[PDB]
Design a protein around this ligand. Structure first.
Ligand code: NA
Ligand code: NA
Lengths: 99, 99
């Protein structure tokens, strides 16, 4: 797709057998989603940092689908004010900024 | 330009007679810049909100140039961990996400 930016670029993702909404966020290094159950091994990761860090679970090589594009990448699962698709998954779907 | 997302999309902007660096951030509604002096009238704006709000100065209709694109838009001036170009100025330069 071509997504303009007059509104927040919220898209549907498919992951963990669920449909979720998440913000395409070029200001986010990583993808962080709340309330998804992913299988298998994970490792703790500290994110944030201003005022302290938040611990999340890092899952690697997770299959996820974003607007018809099936890709694989790291998903952080943990509390987040809003679900976020970061640059790590945008590179996998071939998402660019253009002007 | 076509900007990939393997690295943070930091661009140079010209504003308030200075060259500054700022992040193209589709997850930010607004543009917030630190240590720029803009002339004329402004009004306070509260931004943020998680744990409390931050007060900044809102300047309207500010001329700013982003990668040689001269546009006009609102600039918030105040403390920010990183300078950010939000969606308000990305729409003015005709920036879209594409995949
Ligand atoms: Na990844
Ligand atoms: Na604006």
């Amino acid at each position: 797709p071509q997504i303009t930016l007059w509104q927040r670029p919220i898209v549907t993702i498919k992951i963990g057998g669920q449909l979720k909404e998440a913000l395409l966020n070029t200001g986010a290094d990583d993808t962080v989603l709340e309330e998804v159950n992913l299988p298998g091994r994970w490792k703790p990761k500290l994110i944030g940092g201003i005022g302290g860090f938040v611990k999340v679970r890092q899952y690697d090589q997770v299959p996820i689908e974003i607007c018809g594009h099936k890709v694989i990448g790291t998903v952080l699962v943990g509390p987040t004010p809003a679900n976020v698709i970061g640059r790590n998954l945008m590179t996998q779907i071939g998402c660019t900024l253009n002007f």
